RNA sequence: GGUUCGCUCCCGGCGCUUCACAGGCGCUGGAAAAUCUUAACCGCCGGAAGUCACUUCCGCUGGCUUUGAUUUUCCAGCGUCUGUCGAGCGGAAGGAGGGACCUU
């Protein structure tokens, strides 16, 4: 504070004496014993800054109360340079560890707090007595019996008897109560208790005269006549209260914990009935003692207290009890005001009328009180007056406060001088008079008195001790003085000069009161007599007396490490431990004490217990103390209970329930019961749920080994084996335009090719291919051609033709490729077909025999052409030719032949003035020296495209290609003619795309068969299956009555189940990165929605004992993409995924072509070469013809060339990395993103949903071991799955469902659904703030299931209806539909909010404001002015109501009907146009940049500011709201409004 | 029995 | 059929930044309630003991003061988990089109 803190003479001599030895300072209140305590603390601060372990010490300041502890904390903090520690129970030190105490100890130089907290701190070995320097105990006179001060003093006895901290007690009174006889013995007892010597005034000259500033008051007495007569209304009210008591005793409320007498020999009424009985007894006391008007205020107090209790009642019966009490109080109030008005009818002067009714219906005691105030104050300035009024009862304070308010308002002489206020101790009562939340306030009543706002204070004995008040000039005592200490402290409160002390008594009580006062005076003087007469001794060194005084109590126990359990703390410890044990909502866990009878004492014990009492402890089955424990024989039942509790605590510590520090243990974890079983498969892949998976975003991609389907494996034909050839049909869907004439003509030629396999292919759906000329419908024949390879040379011809196709025709060949027949992956061939015996097509043996290799395009000079024969006119149609003189050597097809045309051609628009003959001489005369067959042969030729990836849909557009393309007429003798049929070449052009599509089509067929076999789905459409043509994904972005949802309809009815199409499985397998015309991204949304719903229902059914928090905690891991990735890897599916975008010439491998077998062998067999073979080392290899054809093993040069990379990358520090870049095709490695695998699993789930309903997809989840089975039943049906119990349903009986639901009929009609089990509805409507939440759950758990169900149903509806919308817009629509704001809008639109069972001011006001705004808006969703706040509770209530509607009927169809009848206008409007979120809309604006902010709350209205741009000028708008989200939304809406302008 | 009888308003603050 | 543009646009995925929606959790403050419990003092009524309602002891019960603990609820701020998804930016690849053309 300031340096002006200079002690008095008495303070300095007191601290000087105190440094020498322990003692107690006895000075009147206001003498600054706090100041001398501060000086003592300062004098002992030599070691405060030093650490404890090195020898540093701290000081203790104990206070009897938390409030006084806080006051002393502020005092010591302001008067010292130390940092003070304020430790009380309410601070939360109940579970602080050793470190959490040590840091506080080392950071604080002096410690303050309540006695119990420091007692626990010392006894739990957080500190030791030797670690303390000086101990301060204010109001030490409370240290009697089993007070915590005396326990702390016994801690000195048990601790080391030397090297002990100093102790001082601060007090202004020593005698507690009426022990005013033989005060010397009590003073000696206080001395030995605190092992010190009391010090007080010794020099009458200096100490007394300096203390004189704390003046003694002038003691005055005011008398009133005794009242013998009681009014008639008094007897009427008494009779009514008596009959109400009779009714209450007859009333049968629910069973309550058994309450019994203090010595437990008699039973007592339950606490709740005891409370109303206590309140009515107190009201009767006020009524009898203080008059009718006082009773008229006390009845208001009873009204508000009973209203609060009814508002917080936990049961219908308790509500009925409090309602009966409330109406009886209302009747009493009516009678009281009636009785007042009978006299107020006398005259019209309303102020004088109120004064005279107060005068006439008051008791003479309060009458005298009012006259005394009137004569004492008499229009004095309010700044001068500060007075306290003391009354006994708590409610008397409030009653006198109200009556004095009314009297002041009725007295013009007293109207402005007095500003009354009332204060009650820890047993607080409601200060309001009207209703709940009369006004929010920040200053306490004592602080209002301190600041001068209030000048008259009415208080109980709470203000008597410790609390700092100004020196009051007047003190009044209303009820007679009961204790000596109360009198002394009340007279001490009147501290200022010439202060007035007034006490009230009856006329017949004057002599007894004066006798008691004179006895108090005699005792007060005897205190000084003892102090001035006692002989000087150092520190009361009679240690034998200390031991004899402390030995009466039971000897405490000390365990290992030095912790100590005092016997008087045993009951508290036992009850604290019994609080921890689990139990039902009603079952009492407190120990059931039982006093043993006379015949039991001498049976359990000997005959010694004939007189002394013995008590036994009986404990419920939930706790460990199953064996009964009998107390030691003690002379009183209180000590017997203490001993029994001490022995029980000792037994519990022996059992290990109490820890080393005698505090019960705690729970560890709850959700691990599921992490033990559901997430087992994580471990084998090097992951676990307990570890930090998201460290640096670990491994978002993984490497997988691709595997060809069962049909493509080991399908290579051999000699003599039966073989199957499937003809491939290409049917062009485009028109026969000039641009497309050759394409259309040559695609439908019967010279189709076929694929050779030893295995039998299943039927395959017609599939699309997109060429430049249009789209193709490629289909594979369902019936193969039976062929037998009778000779080995036939097989060799097939193999050489197969290699020649990919090598020369399609130019897929790379130098390091090897043709092989021993590799079994994709071991199959494609052969050409030709018409044989009619429809019996046969292998084109003539073609393969001639075309073992495509002949080289080579030149021929003029003379060589003359030596060669002329080119036959009929040998060119439909044949492939190439320009051997031009730079481009690409092949090109003959589309038209000419004999009328001639190298001496007719001149054209660009060939003007020249024939084509002379044109070739002009252009390339270096090659074309002359033309030898100038006469009669000509051809028209079309180029063929180099494109192989025919999956791109948009490449086939005709708008640009509508423009004419010039012909290319060519002289025949100058171009080499390939005898290969051009129509077969045009079909071979599409071959790689068809092959790659058939690959994954067979994979999808295998998956279809697997998932059909698991479900036992072998019905009619799965053996004679004929697949629909595979459709385009049009949403891929490349170009009254309720209709039942089809998914649920096929879930319930078998007739609507459709076969799981092969194309759908192919789509579910093909990732979006594959660049195809389809993917899984649409199936993923439905799969994810179903997975969410199924996981929610499964967890809520199996684990009903859990809350929504733990259920969500488990579900977030169960449906996580990591879990789905591991789950799908468990199914060995990721080896069949299509993610590669199929670049043939750079990343593909022909089916008949493999790499050198040494590479494959060392890749597979070497862990160092598992994935780390060099890319460019393998891609730089080159092998000879026969080396690549049959040799297999590469040359040593190339072998070492790639083995050097193998060694340098695998057998080095690069181990664990992947070097398979562009050499993925060698062993079939591929890198697939984790989210792709997770979405594959979700898409498979979605396909099975869409095709087979919900139960079959739940069985699929069981197959994927996502839903782990159980021992009783593996897993039940998803529908009719058993979920419910105490947490999803109200446990109340049918007699109170109508008590809680006042008008359930008009919610039943409004919602459109009729409940047969109202218990679900009751919990759905129950907000968590409702009082019954503590016993019968709330809507919070049911809202989880409701959200899952509503989300899945909405997603399924928008999925099945809006078939052309991509997943992004689909989830935007879903988010707009299931937003909390729109859920609240629908809730208010149906007026469901009226039925919410909630009690909360700031929730109800928000609900009312929002519903008023929505009514003003006319139920139109703004997708607002002055920052309207959305009551988030409404959406949760609607979700829980949906869940209740589902659980009542256990049918998703009825639930969907209800949801649709609620959402119909919302669904229509949002399907017409999706309302993107306002923040999203502002951010996505291409011209405006939101740039928001994260400012402060500056009170309730937390502020957010936005920074956007509008027509090139910057603007700054401000958002306000209750929370950050609402303020940001309002700012975004304002920015949108400005942007619109 | 209708009301409290109103005491003599003149009284003295008696010293202890 | 092909080349080319510093040309226009588009799809998907990777890397960085960031937002929205749904289900949550943790930490820190503010507010409210329920239950249990500790200690001390005084009084009413009853019983007992020394001199036997004088003093004391025991019990009932009421009043005041009071300690510690558990649980529930609401609000705000800061982090964070899961699912759906958008936006901005480096960059690669693919496609469409509009120019420059290139064959015959
Ligand atoms: N020597 C002194 N120097 C400074 N202030 C003093 C001195 N003596 C008394 N005071 C003031 O008088 C007040 C005494 O009140 P308090 O200490 O609460 O009285 P008590 O301790 O007797 O209840 C303190 O607030 C203190 O500031
Ligand atoms: Mg003080
Ligand atoms: Mg997706
Ligand atoms: Mg997904
Ligand atoms: Mg919730
Ligand atoms: Mg919700």
């Amino acid at each position: 504070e300031d340096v002006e803190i200079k002690p008095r003479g008495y303070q300095l001599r007191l601290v000087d004496h105190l440094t020498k030895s322990n003692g107690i300072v006895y000075l009147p209140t206001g003498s600054g014993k706090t100041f001398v305590a501060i000086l003592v603390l300062k004098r002992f601060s030599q070691d405060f800054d030093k650490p404890i372990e090195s020898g540093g010490k701290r000081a203790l300041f104990m206070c009897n109360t938390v409030e006084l502890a806080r006051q002393q904390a502020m005092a010591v903090r302001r008067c010292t340079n130390f940092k003070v520690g304020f430790y009380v129970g309410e601070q939360g030190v109940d579970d602080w560890t050793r470190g959490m105490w040590s840091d506080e100890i080392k950071k604080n130089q002096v410690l303050v707090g309540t006695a119990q907290v420091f007692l626990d701190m010392v006894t739990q070995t957080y500190v030791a007595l030797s670690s303390l320097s000086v101990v301060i105990i204010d109001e030490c006179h409370h240290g009697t019996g089993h007070h915590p001060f005396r326990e702390f003093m016994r801690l000195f006895t048990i601790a080391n008897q030397t090297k002990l901290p100093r102790v001082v007690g601060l007090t202004g009174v020593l005698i507690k109560g009426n022990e005013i006889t033989n005060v010397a013995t009590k003073l000696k007892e206080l001395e030995i208790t605190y092992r010190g010597n009391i010090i007080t005034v010794s020099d009458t000259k200096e100490m007394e005269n300096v203390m004189l500033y704390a003046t003694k008051p002038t003691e005055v007495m005011v008398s009133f006549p005794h009242q013998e007569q009681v009014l008639t209304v008094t007897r009427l009210i008494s009779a009514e209260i008596e009959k109400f008591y009779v009714s209450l005793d007859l009333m049968n409320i629910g069973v309550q914990p058994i309450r019994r007498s203090k010595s437990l020999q008699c039973l007592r009424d339950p606490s709740k009935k005891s409370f109303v009985k206590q309140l009515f007894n107190d009201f009767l006391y006020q009524m009898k003692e203080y008059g009718i008007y006082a009773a008229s205020i006390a009845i208001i107090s009873l009204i508000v207290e009973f209203d609060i209790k009814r508002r917080q009642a936990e049961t219908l019966s308790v509500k009925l009890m409090h309602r009966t009490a409330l109406t009886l109080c209302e009747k009493i109030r009516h009678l009281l005001v009636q009785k007042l008005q009978d006299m107020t009818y006398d005259d019209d002067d309303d102020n004088v009328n109120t004064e005279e009714v107060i005068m006439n219906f008051s008791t003479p005691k309060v009458q005298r009180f009012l006259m005394s105030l009137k004569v004492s104050f008499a229009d004095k300035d309010p700044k001068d007056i500060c007075c306290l009024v003391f009354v006994e009862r708590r409610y008397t304070c409030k009653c006198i406060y109200g009556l004095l308010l009314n009297y002041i308002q009725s007295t013009p002489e007293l109207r402005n001088v007095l500003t009354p206020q009332f204060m009650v101790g820890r047993n607080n009562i409601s200060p309001d008079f009207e209703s709940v939340l009369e006004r929010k306030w920040q200053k306490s009543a004592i602080q209002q008195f301190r600041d001068g706002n209030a000048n008259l204070m009415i208080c109980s004995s709470v203000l008597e001790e410790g609390i700092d008040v100004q020196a009051c000039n007047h003190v009044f005592i209303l009820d007679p003085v009961k204790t000596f200490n109360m009198y002394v402290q009340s007279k001490g409160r009147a501290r200022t000069t010439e202060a007035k002390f007034v006490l009230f008594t009856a006329d017949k009580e004057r002599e007894k009161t004066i006798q008691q006062i004179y006895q108090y005076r005699k005792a007060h003087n005897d205190i000084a007599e003892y102090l001035k007469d006692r002989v000087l001794e150092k520190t009361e060194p009679e240690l034998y007396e200390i031991k004899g005084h402390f030995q009466d109590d039971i000897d405490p126990f000390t365990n290992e490490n030095g912790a100590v359990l005092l016997p008087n703390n045993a009951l508290a410890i036992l009850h604290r431990y019994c609080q921890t044990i689990p139990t039902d909502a009603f079952g009492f866990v407190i120990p059931w004490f039982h006093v043993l009878q006379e015949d039991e004492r001498d049976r359990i014990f000997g005959v010694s217990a004939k007189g002394k009492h013995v008590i036994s402890i009986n404990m419920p089955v939930n706790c460990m103390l199953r064996d009964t424990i009998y107390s030691d024989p003690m002379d009183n039942v209180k000590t017997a209970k203490i001993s029994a509790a001490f022995k029980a605590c000792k037994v519990l510590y022996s059992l290990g329930e109490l820890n080393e520090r005698f505090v019960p243990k705690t729970l560890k974890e709850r959700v691990a019961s599921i992490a033990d079983v559901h997430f087992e498969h994580w471990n084998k892949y090097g992951d676990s749920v307990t570890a930090t998976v998201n460290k640096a975003d670990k491994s978002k991609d993984r490497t997988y080994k691709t595997e060809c389907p069962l049909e493509f494996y080991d399908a290579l034909p051999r000699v003599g084996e039966i073989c199957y050839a499937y003809e491939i049909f290409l049917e062009p869907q485009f028109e026969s335009c000039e641009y497309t004439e050759h394409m259309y003509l040559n695609l439908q030629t019967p010279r189709n090719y076929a694929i050779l396999l030893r295995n039998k292919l299943p039927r395959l759906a017609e599939m699309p291919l997109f060429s430049n000329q249009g789209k193709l419908h490629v289909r594979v024949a369902n019936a193969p051609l039976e062929v037998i390879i009778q000779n080995s040379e036939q097989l060799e011809l097939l193999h050489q033709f197969h290699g020649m196709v990919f090598r020369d025709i399609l130019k897929i060949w790379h130098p390091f490729f090897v043709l092989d027949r021993r590799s079994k992956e994709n071991s199959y061939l494609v052969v050409p077909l030709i018409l044989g015996a009619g429809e019996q097509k046969c292998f084109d043996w003539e073609l393969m025999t001639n075309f073992r290799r495509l002949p080289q395009s080579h030149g021929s000079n003029v003379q060589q052409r003359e030596q060669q024969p002329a080119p036959r006119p009929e040998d060119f149609e439909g044949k492939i030719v190439t320009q051997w003189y031009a730079n481009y050597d690409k092949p090109m097809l003959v589309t038209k032949v000419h004999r009328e045309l001639t190298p001496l051609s007719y001149m054209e628009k660009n060939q003007q003035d020249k024939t084509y003959y002379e044109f070739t001489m002009s252009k390339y005369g270096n090659r074309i020296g002359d033309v030898v067959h100038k006469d009669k042969f000509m051809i028209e030729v079309r180029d063929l495209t180099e494109q192989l990836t025919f999956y791109v849909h948009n490449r086939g557009k005709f708008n640009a290609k509508s423009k004419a393309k010039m012909k290319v007429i060519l002289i025949p003798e100058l171009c080499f003619n390939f005898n290969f049929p051009g129509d077969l070449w045009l079909k071979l052009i599409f071959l790689p795309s068809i092959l790659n599509r058939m690959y994954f089509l067979l994979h999808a067929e295998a998956l279809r068969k697997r998932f059909n076999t698991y479900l036992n789905l072998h019905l009619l459409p799965f053996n004679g299956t004929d697949y629909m043509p595979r459709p385009l994904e049009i949403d891929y972005s490349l170009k009254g009555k309720v209709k039942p949802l089809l998914i649920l309809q096929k879930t319930v009815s078998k007739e609507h189940i459709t076969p799981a199409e092969q194309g759908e499985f192919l789509a579910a397998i093909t990732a979006s990165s594959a660049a195809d015309v389809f993917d899984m991204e649409r199936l993923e949304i439905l799969g994810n929605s179903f997975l969410k719903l199924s996981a929610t229902l499964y967890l809520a059914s199996k684990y009903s004992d859990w809350n929504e928090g733990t259920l969500t905690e488990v579900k977030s891991k169960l449906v996580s993409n990591r879990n789905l990735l591991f789950c799908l890897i468990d199914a060995d599916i990721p080896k069949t995924l299509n993610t590669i975008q199929f670049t043939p010439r750079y990343t593909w491998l022909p089916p008949g072509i493999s790499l050198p077998h040494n590479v494959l062998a060392l890749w597979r067999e070497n862990p160092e070469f598992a994935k780390i073979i060099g890319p460019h080392n393998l891609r730089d290899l080159a092998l000879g013809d026969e080396e690549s054809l049959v040799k297999g093993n590469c040359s040593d040069i190339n072998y070492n060339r790639f083995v050097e990379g193998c060694r340098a990358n695998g057998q080095s520090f690069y181990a664990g990395a992947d070097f398979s870049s562009e050499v993925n095709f060698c062993v079939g490695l591929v890198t697939i993103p984790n989210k792709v695998i997770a979405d594959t699993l979700e898409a498979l789930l979605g396909v099975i949903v869409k095709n087979y309903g919900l139960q079959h997809a739940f069985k699929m989840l069981e197959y994927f071991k996502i839903c782990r089975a159980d021992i009783d039943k593996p897993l039940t049906q998803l529908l009719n799955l058993e979920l419910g119990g105490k947490k999803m349903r109200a446990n109340v009986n049918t007699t109170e469902i109508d008590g809680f639901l006042i008008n359930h009929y008009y919610l039943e009609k409004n919602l459109g659904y009729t409940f047969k089990d109202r218990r679900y509805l009751l919990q759905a409507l129950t907000h968590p703030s409702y009082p019954t939440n503590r016993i019968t759950g709330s809507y919070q758990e049911l809202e989880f299931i409701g959200n899952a169900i509503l989300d899945f149903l909405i997603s399924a509806y928008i999925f099945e209806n809006n078939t052309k919308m991509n997943p992004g817009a689909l989830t935007d629509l879903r988010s707009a539909l299931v937003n909390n704001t729109t859920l609240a809008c629908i809730c208010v639109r149906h007026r469901l909010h009226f039925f919410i069972l909630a009690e909360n001011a700031k929730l109800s006001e928000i609900i009312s404001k929002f519903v008023n705004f929505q009514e003003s808006q006319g139920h139109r969703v703004t997708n607002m002015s002055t920052n309207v706040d959305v009551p988030k509770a409404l959406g949760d209530v609607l979700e829980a109501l949906i869940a209740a509607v589902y659980l009542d009927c256990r049918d998703l169809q009825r639930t969907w009907e209800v949801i649709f009848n609620l959402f119909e206008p919302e669904l229509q409007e949002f399907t017409r146009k999706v309302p993107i979120n306002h923040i999203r809309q502002l951010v996505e604006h291409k011209h405006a940049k939101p740039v928001f902010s994260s400012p402060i709350v500056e009170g309730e209205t937390v502020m957010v500011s936005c920074q956007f741009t509008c027509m090139e000028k910057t603007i700054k708008v401000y958002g306000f709201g209750s929370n950050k989200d609402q303020a940001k939304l309002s700012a975004a809406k304002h920015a949108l409004q400005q942007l619109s302008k | 029995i209708d009301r409290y009888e109103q005491v003599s308003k003149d009284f003295e603050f008696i010293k202890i």
Side-chain angles (χ1 to χ4, degrees), chain A residues 227 229-234 237 285-298 332-347 352-368 370-371 399-400 403 406-407, chain B residues 1-7:
Chain A
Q227 178 69 23
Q229 189 57 268
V230 293
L231 287 80
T232 57
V233 306
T234 68
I237 290 158
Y285 173 97
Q286 298 306 140
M287 201 205 97
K288 182 230 62 174
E289 189 69 24
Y290 289 102
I292 300 302
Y293 204 97
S296 195
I297 277 81
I332 292 327
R333 179 144 90 91
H334 172 72
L335 274 160
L336 284 205
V337 317
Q338 277 213 136
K339 200 54 180 34
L340 297 193
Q341 310 299 19
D342 311 354
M343 83 87 67
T344 73
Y345 301 145
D346 285 354
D347 44 23
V352 186
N353 199 312
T354 300
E355 182 275 346
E356 61 195 301
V357 49
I358 287 168
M359 278 340 298
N360 272 261
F361 285 97
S362 162
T363 181
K365 164 174 164 169
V366 153
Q367 289 168 42
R368 279 316 204 206
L370 304 160
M371 324 169 145
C399 165
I400 297 307
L403 183 135
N406 281 184
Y407 190 75
Chain B
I1 310 163
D2 184 36
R3 272 172 295 111
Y4 282 94
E5 62 280 8
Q6 157 44 300
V7 315

Side-chain angles (χ1 to χ4, degrees), chain A residues 1104-1224:
Chain A
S1104 181
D1105 310 312
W1106 289 10
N1107 52 11
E1108 92 271 9
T1110 45
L1111 289 168
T1112 296
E1113 232 159 75
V1114 161
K1115 190 184 76 180
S1116 87
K1117 248 71 67 166
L1118 183 146
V1119 310
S1120 64
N1121 283 183
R1122 196 80 164 206
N1123 178 60
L1124 300 183
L1125 168 136
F1126 295 136
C1127 161
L1128 201 61
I1129 293 176
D1130 277 12
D1132 212 24
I1133 293 180
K1135 73 195 179 175
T1136 73
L1137 302 186
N1138 168 235
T1139 73
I1140 287 308
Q1141 75 156 102
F1142 185 63
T1143 298
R1145 264 191 259 287
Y1146 301 83
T1147 58
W1148 198 47
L1149 262 195
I1153 296 184
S1154 287
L1155 274 199
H1157 302 348
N1158 41 280
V1159 193
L1160 277 288
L1162 69 90
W1163 200 322
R1164 185 175 182 84
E1165 296 158 30
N1166 289 87
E1168 310 105 300
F1169 305 150
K1171 63 186 69 180
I1172 318 143
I1173 309 205
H1176 59 279
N1177 284 21
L1178 273 179
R1179 290 196 285 101
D1180 284 1
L1181 304 189
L1183 309 181
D1185 201 60
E1186 291 95 339
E1187 185 181 5
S1188 181
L1189 284 170
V1190 288
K1191 207 174 195 288
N1193 175 230
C1194 64
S1195 47
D1196 200 22
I1197 300 101
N1198 290 286
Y1199 175 87
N1200 282 276
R1201 204 268 164 284
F1202 89 96
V1203 158
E1204 82 165 31
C1206 303
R1207 288 185 179 127
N1209 303 294
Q1211 286 181 321
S1212 75
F1213 72 95
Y1214 275 134
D1218 188 8
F1219 274 72
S1220 193
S1221 190
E1222 292 92 38
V1223 299
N1224 287 317

